[PDB]
C-alpha cells in the first residue's frame, strides 16, 4: 500500500473479527491511528480528533497550529488520538488493504457507515485502556463521527465539538459527491474498480477533486484570490493552472476505490436512524456539553443546520467563525478554531 | 449541416458581410440568427430585447413560455419582442458550427468574441430592422451581462433595463466553475483539440461539464426538498444518481463541445468598466436608465451582495428579490414571479 507507505510512523491495531452493521464480517482488520501526549493515571484525559474525508490520521499535517502547550490539543494535559476511518487508503481496512481471502480488497471492500467507524474505533480505545473521553472534536466528515460518538452518553464522552458538518445526508451533498463519483465511474481507466493500482483513473480523480475543492470554497474567497485588472496566481488567467495543480497532486496520491468507498459513507449518515422519529428528537438525546463551530458562508453544511443543532442539543453553544471563507474555514482560520476549542475545553 | 440549428423552429438570419471583433479579428459573411414576436409600432420604439442564457437558442418561448402573451411581461400586443442568438452559439449566429468563409465550419478556429461584440453586431441588426428606440432590455445570467452592456448606449436609445441573476464583471468564483467545466471537455480524448468530427463529440466531457453547471444552478434547499432520506425509525437519495445523468446526457446529445468552450469563454471578457471607468461602482453610476435588478438570495453563482451593489450604484434602480428558495435557476423555476416583476416595471411610466 503506497498511500500508507508515504505517511509518517503510526500504530496499527488489529481486530480479528468485526461485524459491520450490514452484517458483513471483516476479518483481521487493521485500524491505523496516531496519538500525541500521554494518558493520565485515571485514563480519562483522552481527546479524540476525527479527521476529514481525504486526510490520514496525522492531524498535525493539516491542523498543525492546534497542537502544543496552551493550544487546543495540549499534549501536556491530554492524550490526543485520531484513528483512520475504514475505507481510507491510510492504514485502516479499505480497498487498499490486504483481503484476508488471498491481493487487496480493491473494488470489493464492503460498505461501511459512520457508526461502523465509531464502533471499531471505540474497540481500539478499549484496548488502549481509555476509560473516559474528555472531548471529541471533528470537522466535515469528522463532525459526523463526533455527533455519533456523543451517543455513548455523557458518562463516557464528556464533551463534543462538531465543526462544519451535519446530522444527516442531504440531497445537496449527495448530489455533489455522486457527481464526483460519476467522474471516476466514467473514466475508462476505472475498469469497474478493477484498475491496476499504478494505472489509476487519474482524470476522474482529478476532476472529482477540482469539484470538491471548489465546493469547499466561498465566492468571496475565490474572488479575492483571482480577479481582473481595474477598468481603466491572482489574475483570471491563473485559475486554469491553480485548478490543475492541486487536483493533480491529489489524484497522484489517493486511491479511486477509496474515494468511492469514503464518499459513500456520507449516504449512510443519519444520527436519528433507529433512534428517534426525527433529527431534532435525536439531537435532544445528546446530553453532553457541545460546541458547534460553523461559518455563515459554508456552501456544503449550512449555517441553518448548525443553528438547528444548537437549538435541539440542550447544553450547546453555537460558535460562528468571523470569516468569509466557506467550508474549509476550519483549516484557513485554524487559529480561530483553536481558540474556540481551547476556551471550551478549559471550562 | 448544422444539426443544432436544424432542430429549431423557424427563425430569421441577418447577414453582416464584414464585422470587426474588438480583438481586431474580422468576421466575414456573418450570420446573426434571431427570432421576434409581435410587431413594431409606427414610431418603431416599442422594441423589447430579450437576451438569452448561455446554452439556449433565441427561442425564448421554449424556456420562458409563460412570460409571453397578452397582459404578460412580453406582451406581443404592445411590443416588438426580439432575441438575437449570441456569436459562438450553435443555434444560428456565427460560431464553431457555422461555415468558415475561407473554405467546412469554423470548428475549433472560431475567434474569441466578447459580450461587447454580441451587443455591437446585435445593434447593427436592430438598425437594419429600423428600431429607433428600445423600450427595455431584459436578460438573465449571461443575458444580464449583455443587458448591462446595452444600457451604455444611453437612455435615449435604451429606455430601461432588467438585469436578472447576473454580474458586472467576471469573478474568480465563476471563472473557476466554468474553467473546471471546460477542462472536462479538454480532457475527453474524443475532443481531439477541437478537431473532433461533428457526429463523434466529446460526449462524456460535455455531460460532465453540464452536471456540474446544473448543480451550480441549484440551491441547497431546492436539492434537499427534491431528494432526502426516509425519517428515523423521483425523491429518495437513490434517485440522485440518475437525475444527474439524465438531463446531462440529453444536453450532450444536443449541444456542441466547441460552442460550449467558445460561449463560456465569453464570461472571461465581461467587465462593464473596462475602458470606461476606474471601478465597477463608477461604471454602474454611468447607467442612467431606470433599472430593475432581479435576484435570489440563494443564487450560488451570482451573489445576492453583487446585486445589492448594482442597486446601490445604479442611480435609478429598484432591487427585486424573488421570494424563493431556488438557486440560480429561479428565473426559470419561478417564471411567474419574474413575469409579474418584469410586467410591473414595464407598465411603469
Ligand atoms: O472538508 C474536508 C476537506 C478536506 C478533505 O480532505 O476532505 N481537506 C483537505 O484536503 C484540506 N486541507 C487543505 O485543503 C489545505 C489547504 C490548501 C487549499 N485549500 C488552498 O488554500 O488553496 C481540507 S479542506 C476540505
Ligand atoms: O444560467 C443558465 C441557465 C441555462 C442555460 O442554458 O445556460 N438554463 C438552461 O439550460 C435552463 N432551462 C431549463 O429549463 C433548465 C432547468 C433547470 C435545471 N438546472 C434543472 O432543474 O435541473 C436554464 S437554467 C440557467
C-alpha B140/C-alpha B209 separation (Å) is: 20
Closest by CA to B81, choosing from B89, B71, B69, B92, is B69
Instruction: Annotate B184-248 with DSSP letters as a single string.
Output: HHHTSTTSGGGT--TTS--HHHHHHHHHHHHHHTS-HHHHHHHSBPPP----BGGGHHHHHHHHH
First and final CA of chain A: distance in angstroms?
Answer: 43
| Count of CA atoms in the C-beta half-sphere (13 A) of A161 | 27
Give yes or no for a contact between A292 and A317, defined as CB atoms under 8 angstroms apart.
Answer: yes
- Joined together, the cell numbers standing for residue B187 give 480532457
The backbone torsions φ and ψ at residue B161, rounded to the nearest 5 degrees and listed phi first, read -130, 145
For chain A, how many residues are written? Answer: 347
Q: What is the DSSP letter of B302?
A: S
- Joined together, the cell numbers standing for residue A150 give 456523543
Residue B13, strand partner residues? B33
Closest by CA to A50, choosing from A164, A154, A130, is A164
After what residues is chain A interrupted, C–N > 2.5 A?
102, 232
What CATH number is given to the structural domain containing B234?
A: 3.40.50.1820
Give yes or no for a contact between B344 and B73, defined as CB atoms under 8 angstroms apart.
Answer: no
C-alpha A81/C-alpha A57 separation (Å) is: 8
Of A211, A225, A276, the CB nearest to B180: A211
Q: Ligand 1 atom 2: the closest Cα is on which residue?
A: A52
C-alpha A247/C-alpha A233 separation (Å) is: 16
The backbone torsions φ and ψ at residue A73, rounded to the nearest 5 degrees and listed phi first, read -95, 75
- Joined together, the cell numbers standing for residue A278 give 426525527
Enumerate residues 6+ apart whose C-beta is below 8 A from A346.
Answer: none
- Joined together, the cell numbers standing for residue B261 give 468552450
How many distinct structural domains can be found in chain B?
1
Residues touching ligand 1 (Cβ under 6 Å) are A 52-55, 62, 140, 216, 327-328, 331
Q: What is the DSSP letter of B147?
A: H
Burial, A336: exposed, middle or buried (Cβ in 10 Å; 0-12, 13-18, 19+)?
A: middle
- Joined together, the cell numbers standing for residue B68 give 409571453
Going by their DSSP bridges, the two strands B26-37 and B80-84 should be labelled as: antiparallel
User: Longest Cα pair distance anywhere in chain A, in angstroms?
Assistant: 70
Give yes or no for a contact between A213 and A53, defined as CB atoms under 8 angstroms apart.
Answer: no
First and final CA of chain B: distance in angstroms?
Answer: 47
C-alpha A195/C-alpha B301 separation (Å) is: 36
Instruction: Annotate B52-83 with DSSP letters as a single string.
Output: --TT--S-GGGTSGGGBSTTSSB-TTT-EEEE
Domain extent, residue B193, equals 1-349
Closest by CA to B90, choosing from B101, B105, B102, B103, is B105
- Joined together, the cell numbers standing for residue A335 give 487559529
Going from the Cα of A236 to the center of ligand 1, the distance in angstroms, rounded, reads 22
Task: Tell me the three-class secondary structure of chain A, residue by residue.
Answer: CHHHHCCCCCEEEEEEEEECCCCCEEEEEEEEEEEECCCCCCCCCEEEEECCCCCCCCHHHCCHHHECCCCCECCCCCEEEEECCCCCCCCCCCCCCECCCCCECHHHCCCCCHHHHHHHHHHHHHHHCCCCEEEEEEECHHHHHHHHHHHHCCCCECCEEEECCCCECCHHHHHHHHHHHHHHHCCCCCHHHCCCCCCCCHHHHHHHHHHHHHHCCCHHHHHHHCECCCCCCCEHHHHHHHHHHHHHHHHHCCCHHHHHHHHHHHHHCECCCCCCCCHHHHHHCCCCCEEEEECCCCCCCCHHHHHHHHHHCCCEEEEECCCCCCCCHHHHCHHHHHHHHHHHHHC
* 3-class secondary-structure state, position B101: coil
Of B207, B240, B282, the CB nearest to A178: B240
C-alpha B189/C-alpha A204 separation (Å) is: 13
| Count of CA atoms in the C-beta half-sphere (13 A) of B240 | 27
Enumerate residues 6+ apart whose C-beta is below 8 A from B22.
Answer: B114, B116, B117, B120
Q: Ligand 1 atom 1: the closest Cα is on which residue?
A: A140
- Joined together, the cell numbers standing for residue B50 give 430579450
From the centroid of its chain, how far is CA A108? Answer: 22
* 3-class secondary-structure state, position B253: helix
Closest by CA to B259, choosing from B299, B329, B210, B212, is B210
Resolution (A): 2.6
Closest by CA to A282, choosing from A256, A258, A312, A305, is A312
C-alpha B287/C-alpha B302 separation (Å) is: 20
C-alpha A104/C-alpha A241 separation (Å) is: 34
Which of B36, B57, B141, B298 is an active site residue? B141
Residue with grid cell 413575469, as numbered in its chain? B339
Note if A327 is an active site residue.
Answer: yes
Going by their DSSP bridges, the two strands A290-294 and B291-295 should be labelled as: unpaired
Closest by CA to A50, choosing from A59, A42, A41, is A59
C-alpha B158/C-alpha B152 separation (Å) is: 8
C-alpha B28/C-alpha B15 separation (Å) is: 9
Q: What is the DSSP letter of B14?
A: E
After what residues is chain B interrupted, C–N > 2.5 A?
103, 233
Interface contact B275-A231, CB threshold 8 A: yes
The backbone torsions φ and ψ at residue B131, rounded to the nearest 5 degrees and listed phi first, read -65, 125
Instruction: Annotate B153-185 with DSSP letters as a single string.
Output: G-TTTB--EEEES--SB--HHHHHHHHHHHHHH
Closest by CA to B198, choosing from B313, B54, B95, B342, is B95
Interface contact A282-B245, CB threshold 8 A: no
- Please report, for residues A323, A338, B95, B212, the alpha-carbon distance to residue A332 in angstroms, rounded to integers and kept in the order given: 9, 12, 43, 25
In Å, how far is B19's CA from the nearest CA of chain A? 25
Closest by CA to B63, choosing from B95, B91, B96, is B91
Closest by CA to A43, choosing from A124, A111, A128, A105, is A128
Atom of ligand 2 nearest to the CA of B217: 19
CB atoms within 10 A of CB A303: 14
* 3-class secondary-structure state, position B298: coil
Give yes or no for a contact between B208 and A186, defined as CB atoms under 8 angstroms apart.
Answer: yes
C-alpha B276/C-alpha B244 separation (Å) is: 42
Cβ-Cβ contacts under 8 Å, B190 against chain A: none
Enumerate residues 6+ apart whose C-beta is below 8 A from A196.
Answer: none
Closest by CA to A327, choosing from A224, A216, A219, A225, is A216
C-alpha B329/C-alpha B140 separation (Å) is: 9
| Count of CA atoms in the C-beta half-sphere (13 A) of B267 | 29
Q: What is the DSSP letter of B151?
A: G
- What is chain B's percent helix, strand, coil content, to nearest 5? 40, 15, 40
Residue A113, strand partner residues? none
Which of A55, A92, A140, A218 is an active site residue? A140
Give yes or no for a contact between A231 and B271, defined as CB atoms under 8 angstroms apart.
Answer: yes
The backbone torsions φ and ψ at residue B269, rounded to the nearest 5 degrees and listed phi first, read -80, -15
- Joined together, the cell numbers standing for residue A296 give 455563515
* 3-class secondary-structure state, position B135: strand
C-alpha A165/C-alpha A174 separation (Å) is: 14
Going from the Cα of A111 to the center of ligand 1, the distance in angstroms, rounded, reads 25
Note if B141 is an active site residue.
Answer: yes
Going by their DSSP bridges, the two strands A316-320 and B12-20 should be labelled as: unpaired
Residue with grid cell 469539484, as numbered in its chain? A211
Going from the Cα of B214 to the center of ligand 2, the distance in angstroms, rounded, reads 7
Residue with grid cell 469497474, as numbered in its chain? A192
Residue A217, strand partner residues? none
- Joined together, the cell numbers standing for residue A121 give 474505533
Closest by CA to B213, choosing from B242, B169, B161, B178, is B178
Interface contact B184-A174, CB threshold 8 A: no
Closest by CA to A168, choosing from A278, A66, A44, is A278
User: Could you give the residue ranges of the DSSP H alpha helices within B61-150?
Assistant: 115-128, 142-150
Give yes or no for a contact between B248 and B210, defined as CB atoms under 8 angstroms apart.
Answer: yes
From the centroid of its chain, how far is CA B60? Answer: 10
Amino acid at each position: 500500500n503506497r498511500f500508507e507507505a508515504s505517511l509518517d510512523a503510526q500504530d496499527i491495531a488489529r481486530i480479528s473479527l468485526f461485524t459491520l452493521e450490514s452484517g458483513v464480517i471483516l476479518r483481521d482488520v487493521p485500524v491505523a491511528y496516531k496519538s500525541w501526549g500521554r494518558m493520565n493515571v485515571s485514563r480519562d484525559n483522552c481527546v479524540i480528533v476525527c479527521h476529514t474525508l481525504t486526510s490520514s490520521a496525522h492531524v498535525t499535517s493539516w491542523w498543525p497550529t492546534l497542537f502544543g502547550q496552551g493550544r487546543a490539543f495540549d499534549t501536556s494535559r491530554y492524550f490526543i488520538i485520531c484513528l483512520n476511518y475504514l475505507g481510507s487508503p491510510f492504514g485502516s481496512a479499505g480497498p487498499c488493504s490486504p483481503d484476508p481471502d488471498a491481493r487487496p480488497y480493491g473494488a470489493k471492500f464492503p460498505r461501511t457507515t459512520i457508526r461502523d467507524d465509531v464502533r471499531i474505533h471505540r474497540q481500539v480505545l478499549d484496548r488502549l485502556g481509555v476509560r473516559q473521553i474528555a472531548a471529541v472534536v471533528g470537522a466535515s466528515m469528522g463532525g459526523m463521527h463526533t455527533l455519533e460518538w456523543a451517543f455513548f452518553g455523557p458518562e463516557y464522552v464528556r464533551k463534543i465539538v462538531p465543526i462544519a458538518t451535519s446530522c444527516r445526508q442531504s440531497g445537496w451533498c449527495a448530489a455533489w459527491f455522486e457527481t464526483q463519483r460519476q467522474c471516476i465511474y466514467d473514466d475508462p481507466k476505472y475498469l469497474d474498480g478493477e484498475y491496476d493500482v499504478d494505472d489509476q483513473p487519474v482524470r476522474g480523480l482529478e476532476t472529482a477533486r477540482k469539484i470538491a475543492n471548489l465546493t469547499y470554497k466561498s465566492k468571496p474567497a475565490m474572488d479575492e484570490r483571482f480577479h481582473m485588472a481595474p477598468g481603466v496566481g491572482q489574475p483570471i488567467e491563473a485559475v486554469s493552472s491553480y485548478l490543475r495543480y492541486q487536483a493533480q497532486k491529489f489524484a497522484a496520491s489517493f486511491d479511486a476505490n477509496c474515494y468511492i468507498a469514503m464518499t459513500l459513507k456520507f449516504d449512510t449518515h443519519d444520527i436519528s436512524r433507529g433512534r428517534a422519529g426525527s433529527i431534532p428528537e435525536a439531537l435532544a438525546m445528546i446530553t453532553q456539553p457541545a460546541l458547534i463551530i460553523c461559518a455563515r458562508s459554508d456552501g456544503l453544511y449550512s449555517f441553518d443546520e448548525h443553528v438547528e443543532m444548537g437549538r435541539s442539543i440542550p447544553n450547546s453553544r453555537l460558535c460562528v467563525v468571523d470569516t468569509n471563507e466557506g467550508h474549509d474555514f476550519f483549516v484557513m482560520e485554524a487559529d480561530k478554531v483553536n481558540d474556540a476549542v481551547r476556551g471550551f475545553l478549559d471550562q
